[PDB]
Design an enzyme around this catalytic site. Structure first.
Site, PDB file in Angstrom:
ATOM      1  N   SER A  46       0.595   0.224   1.696  1.00 31.47           N
ATOM      2  CA  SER A  46      -0.146  -1.230   2.481  1.00 31.47           C
ATOM      3  C   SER A  46      -0.118  -1.924   1.123  1.00 31.47           C
ATOM      4  CB  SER A  46      -0.976  -1.264   3.124  1.00 31.47           C
ATOM      5  OG  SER A  46      -0.719  -0.478   4.688  1.00 31.47           O
ATOM      6  N   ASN A 108       1.648  -4.543  10.462  1.00 27.21           N
ATOM      7  CA  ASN A 108       2.863  -4.002   9.891  1.00 27.21           C
ATOM      8  C   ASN A 108       3.418  -5.280   9.745  1.00 27.21           C
ATOM      9  OD1 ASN A 108       2.411  -1.781   7.872  1.00 27.21           O
ATOM     10  ND2 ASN A 108       1.612  -0.906   9.937  1.00 27.21           N
ATOM     11  N   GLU A 145       8.959   2.454   6.511  1.00 23.82           N
ATOM     12  CA  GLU A 145       9.723   3.325   6.051  1.00 23.82           C
ATOM     13  C   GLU A 145       8.993   3.454   4.243  1.00 23.82           C
ATOM     14  OE1 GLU A 145      13.455   0.604   5.852  1.00 23.82           O
ATOM     15  OE2 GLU A 145      13.347   1.786   7.202  1.00 23.82           O
ATOM     16  N   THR A 212      -6.050  -2.071   0.123  1.00 24.86           N
ATOM     17  CA  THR A 212      -6.269  -0.648   0.332  1.00 24.86           C
ATOM     18  C   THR A 212      -4.663  -0.237   1.157  1.00 24.86           C
ATOM     19  OG1 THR A 212      -6.412  -0.977   3.160  1.00 24.86           O
ATOM     20  CG2 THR A 212      -9.138  -0.692   1.416  1.00 24.86           C
TER      21      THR A 212
END
Ligand code: CL
Ligand code: CL
Length: 267
Positions: A46, A108, A145, A212
């Site tokens: 991320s 996301n 992905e 993070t």
């Protein structure tokens, strides 16, 4: 030898959890750096979202976008782990709120929506990293992905050094002029996912912005921070880790501990 000592301790630390720790730390008020596997590739997870956010402000500063335009997605199937985008689904978000959700909560959908609509996708995002002198970072896939963390796979990886140099140009440097750099600093400062990583490495009255990442495979997790210590110039800390087995749980404390050792090696 203070760097040899730190190196030893990271090395011990990596044996303990059977994995791989990558570090780069900078002290901007002394120049002192410390690095371990600093130029080895790690999966981003991320963590590239800190960079997406900056991309987004760069676009506001060029007036290509407005920070307050509404971004509407009431018919979209929302990526897993979209805590923020989900509660605003009916009404939209400001581009600035969307950007910030992707940063601070690692949302996301906010991520996907932003890269599909404003940024040119994964390679759009790559291009911007290239545009700040960063030749290591690469982004190949979209928000889910990219988290496979398959050992030996170059997709969706960077080196710790490249992350750190990048965060430094962006958080502390001059890619983003005054007001918008200050915004982005605020966004990092308000990240919510990082309490058990670099923040846990430092006295709680020091100021920390971070992003993070947590791939959820290969025990792969990371953190990068700008840190403002009291009476002292900012630091940059970049910590990456992978593990040997696919089913390996990521380790927050290893991250927290490698940042403690890093911060000592540059002091
Ligand atoms: Cl190194
Ligand atoms: Cl900047």
């Amino acid at each position: 030898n203070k760097s040899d000592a730190a190196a030893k301790q990271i090395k011990k630390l990596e044996e303990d959890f059977d994995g791989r720790i990558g570090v780069f730390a900078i002290d901007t008020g002394s120049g002192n750096t410390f690095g371990y596997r600093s130029d080895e590739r790690f999966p981003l997870c991320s963590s590239f979202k800190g960079f997406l956010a900056a991309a987004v402000l760069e676009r506001v500063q060029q007036k290509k976008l407005d920070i307050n335009q509404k971004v509407k997605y009431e018919s979209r199937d929302l990526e897993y782990h979209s805590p923020i985008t989900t509660k605003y689904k009916g009404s939209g978000m400001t581009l600035g709120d969307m950007a910030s959700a992707a940063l601070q909560y690692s949302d996301n959908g906010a991520t996907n929506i932003i890269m599909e609509r404003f940024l040119g996708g994964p390679e759009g995002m790559t291009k911007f990293m290239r545009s700040i002198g960063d030749n290591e970072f690469r982004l190949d896939r979209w928000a889910l992905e990219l988290n496979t963390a398959i050992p030996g796979d170059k997709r969706d990886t960077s080196t710790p050094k490249a992350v750190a140099n990048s965060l430094n140009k962006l958080a502390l440097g001059n890619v983003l002029n005054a007001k918008v750099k200050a915004i982005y600093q605020n966004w990092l400062k308000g990240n919510t996912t990082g309490d058990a990583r670099i923040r846990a490495s430092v006295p709680a009255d020091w100021v920390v912005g971070d992003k993070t990442g947590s791939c959820g495979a290969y025990g792969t997790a990371n953190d990068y921070a700008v840190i403002w210590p009291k009476n002292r110039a900012p630091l940059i800390v970049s910590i990456y880790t992978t593990r040997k087995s696919k089913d390996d749980k990521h380790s927050d404390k290893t991250i927290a501990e490698a940042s403690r050792i890093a911060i000592q090696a540059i002091d």
